[PDB]
Structures are given as structure tokens and as C-alpha cells.
Amino acid sequence: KSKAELQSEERKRIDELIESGKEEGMKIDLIDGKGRGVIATKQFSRGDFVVEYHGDLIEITDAKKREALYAQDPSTGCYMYYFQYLSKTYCVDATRETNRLGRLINHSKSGNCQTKLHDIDGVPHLILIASRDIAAGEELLYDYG
Amino acid sequence: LQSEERKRIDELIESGKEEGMKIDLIDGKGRGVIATKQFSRGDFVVEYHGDLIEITDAKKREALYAQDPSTGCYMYYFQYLSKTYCVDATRETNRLGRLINHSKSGNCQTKLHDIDGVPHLILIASRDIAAGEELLYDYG
Numbered sequence: 372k373s374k375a376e377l378q379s380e381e382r383k384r385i386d387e388l389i390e391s392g393k394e395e396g397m398k399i400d401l402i403d404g405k406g407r408g409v410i411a412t413k414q415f416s417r418g419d420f421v422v423e424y425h426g427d428l429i430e431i432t433d434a435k436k437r438e439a440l441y442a443q444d445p446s447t448g449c450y451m452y453y454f455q456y457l458s459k460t461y462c463v464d465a466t467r468e469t470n471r472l473g474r475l476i477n478h479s480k481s482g483n484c485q486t487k488l489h490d491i492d493g494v495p496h497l498i499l500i501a502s503r504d505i506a507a508g509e510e511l512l513y514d515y516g
Numbered sequence: 517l518q519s520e521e522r523k524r525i526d527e528l529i530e531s532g533k534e535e536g537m538k539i540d541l542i543d544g545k546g547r548g549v550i551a552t553k554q555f556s557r558g559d560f561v562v563e564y565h566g567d568l569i570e571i572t573d574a575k576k577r578e579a580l581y582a583q584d585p586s587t588g589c590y591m592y593y594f595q596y597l598s599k600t601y602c603v604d605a606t607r608e609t610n611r612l613g614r615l616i617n618h619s620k621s622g623n624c625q626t627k628l629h630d631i632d633g634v635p636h637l638i639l640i641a642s643r644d645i646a647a648g649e650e651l652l653y654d655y656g
């Protein structure tokens with residue numbers, strides 16, 4: 372098995388996890404009854420898929436509408452992530468309060484997760500991959516990469 | 517009298533003195549603002565102070581702020597005289613207007629105050645406020 376073939380089977384494993392929505396290997400951090408972060412409950416190797424930043428994938432026109440509606444209510448939060456993909460502006464809108472864990476992962480300048488665009492049939496997905504080997508029990512912390 | 521009253525609100529905005537309020541501290545973190553004196557309905561409370569910029573410089577800053585989630589989301593956009601402005605309160609400062617929490621049933625509301633054609637976003641009392649109340653804003 373070549374490196375190219377190993378990368379193909381990895382992408383297929385990520386496709387299956389994205390479309391199944393299963394988010395194993397992680398759990399919510401609780402202080403004072405509030406979901407404040409996410410802890411790894413299993414090892415992750417450098418480059419392994421961790422979780423998707425899940426949300427509605429939309430373009431700028433729909434996004435600017437939602438943003439004006441969201442501004443009227445601070446209870447929403449700022450969860451709209453903008454990015455370029457193949458000379459095209461996209462937005463992942465995770466405003467919606469859900470059980471998904473990707474939007475609960477805290478930022479750190481020296482985190483253990485970084486962002487990456489994962490293509491499925493030409494549709495970009497923002498995923499978090501391990502920027503280094505992660506031990507079980509670590510808080511997951513993301514930076515932009 | 518009208519000219520005089522409008523001049524006093526201007527002086528408050530320009531002097532930057534923010535009397536009648538104080539920080540609410542939990543765990544050493546500034547989390548809210550408490551009134552230390554009464555306010556009557558319609559009284560000036562505080563400015564949401566920041567850089568007043570237009571749509572071009574605003575997007576340039578917002579993308580730069582996005583790469584650093586430790587900044588927070590402090591850019592407030594609004595229309596004034598058929599022109600889009602933004603008040604950028606991102607810089608962490610001692611100003612208290614950016615510390616006031618939002619509540620659908622708050623005691624403060626937003627209002628645009630003109631100073632020589634330049635809009636300022638201020639908070640006014642939407643009802644009589646007793647001393648000791650937490651200041652909570654909504655959009656008016």
C-alpha cells in the first residue's frame with residue numbers, strides 16, 4: 372500500500388464519519404453545569420481527523436442575511452466561519468445550538484488541533500485535525516492551520 | 517435650552533468620563549456593569565466607544581480579528597443618513613459601554629447621537645433605573 376493509497380482510505384474514513392455525524396473519542400468539559408470545552412477521551416495521532424466544525428454551508432448572500440438577523444440577538448453567539456475554497460467565498464454557520472462538539476472546542480495559540488478543508492464531491496467541509504500526537508485526557512484546543 | 521442640553525451630552529461623550537457606573541467582578545473577570553446612581557428614562561448612560569469606520573476598513577479589521585478569537589466580536593454596524601458605519605470596540609480598554617450585557621428586558625437602549633455630522637452610538641435609559649441595578653442593553 373502506497374502513501375497515496377493510504378491517503379485515499381483515510382479520506383474515505385473521514386467521509387463516513389462526516390456523513391454519519393458520530394463524534395467519538397471526545398466529551399464535553401463541565402464547569403458549573405455549563406459546556407465550556409472538549410476533552411479527548413482517546414489518543415489521536417498527528418494528522419488524524421478529530422471532528423468537523425459542523426454547520427450550514429452557505430454563500431455570502433445568505434450569510435450576510437443570517438448575520439444581520441443574528442446581531443439582533445446576542446444569545447446566538449458568533450459562530451459563522453468564512454473561508455476561501457477554489458476562488459470562492461464560503462461560510463460555515465454553526466450558530467445553532469446543537470449537540471455537535473466541534474463548535475465547543477476552545478481556541479489556543481498553542482493548541483493541538485488545526486483547521487483543514489476536506490472535499491466531498493466538490494463540497495468543502497471544515498474539519499479539525501490533530502496538529503500533534505494528542506494524549507487521552509487532553510483538552511482539545513484549535514488554531515488556524 | 518435644547519442647544520444647551522445637546523451640548524452637555526456632547527461634553528460627556530468627549531470627556532470620556534463614565535460616572536455613575538462600576539464594573540461587576542466575578543472571579544476577577546469584568547463580566548458586567550452596575551449602576552451606582554439613579555438614571556431617569558431617556559438619560560444618557562454611556563457611549564459604546566470605539567473606532568468609527570466605514571465598510572471597507574471594517575471588513576479588513578474583521579478578517580484580521582477572526583484569526584484571533586481572543587479579541588472578541590465587538591464590531592457594531594449601523595445605518596446613518598443612508599450610509600453604513602461601524603463602531604469597532606475591539607481594543608480592550610477601560611471603557612465600560614462594551615462591558616454592558618444584553619438583555620431582551622434590559623433597562624438601556626441604543627440611540628444615535630450626532631456630533632457635527634458624526635454619529636455616536638450611545639446607551640440611554642429605557643426606564644427609570646435604581647442605583648444598584650445591573651445595566652442591560654437592547655436595541656432601540
Ligand SMILES: */C=C\C(=O)NCCCNc1nc(N2CCCC2)nc2cc(OCCN)c(OC)cc12
Nearest residue numbers: 448449547564588589590591592614615616617626
Ligand atoms: C458575532 C458578532 C456579534 O455578536 N456582534 C454584536 C455587535 C458587536 N458586539 C457588541 N456590541 C455591543 N453593543 C452594540 C451597541 C450597543 C452595545 N455590546 C457588546 C458587549 C459585549 O460584552 C458584553 C459583556 N459580556 C461583547 O462581547 C464580545 C460584544 C458587544
Ligand SMILES: C#CC(=O)NCCCNc1nc(N2CCCC2)nc2cc(OCCN)c(OC)cc12
Nearest residue numbers: 424448449450451452474475476477486582588589
Ligand atoms: C466575532 C466573530 C468571530 O469571532 N468569528 C470566529 C469564527 C466563527 N466562530 C467560531 N469558530 C470556530 N471555528 C472555526 C473553524 C475552526 C473552529 N470555533 C468557535 C468556537 C466557539 O466556542 C468555543 C467554546 N468557547 C465560538 O463561540 C462563539 C465561536 C467559534
